[PDB]
């Protein structure tokens, strides 16, 4: 009843890579945009602020955002 969200550039990239039927890594900064069904099985590398982190997309992911899967904070221990 209101649109979900995804970055334009991201959307059309996924369009092209879907049509040409190859699995290529996608470096993206959109830490907001939702994972819509038509991207599943792709590998997307999301910006953690320094590095891109490769994530494999799955059936489960859909309905969340991208940034849930790239932890921004480096913490192990006191």
């Amino acid at each position: 009843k209101k649109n979900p969200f995804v970055a334009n550039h991201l959307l059309r990239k996924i369009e092209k890579l879907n049509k040409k039927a190859e699995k290529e890594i996608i470096v993206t900064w959109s830490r907001a945009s939702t994972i819509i069904p038509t991207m599943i099985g792709h590998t997307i590398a999301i910006h953690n602020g320094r590095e891109h982190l490769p994530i494999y997309i799955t059936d489960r992911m859909v309905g969340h955002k991208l940034g849930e899967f790239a932890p921004t904070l480096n913490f192990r221990g006191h």
């Binding site: 649109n3 979900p4 819509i36 069904p37 059936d59 859909v62």
Partner: peptide, 11 residues
């Protein structure tokens, strides 16, 4: 099912 769950909201 999270794909169809997503399509029931939007479609």
């Amino acid at each position: 099912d999270q794909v169809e769950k997503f399509r029931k909201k939007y479609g």
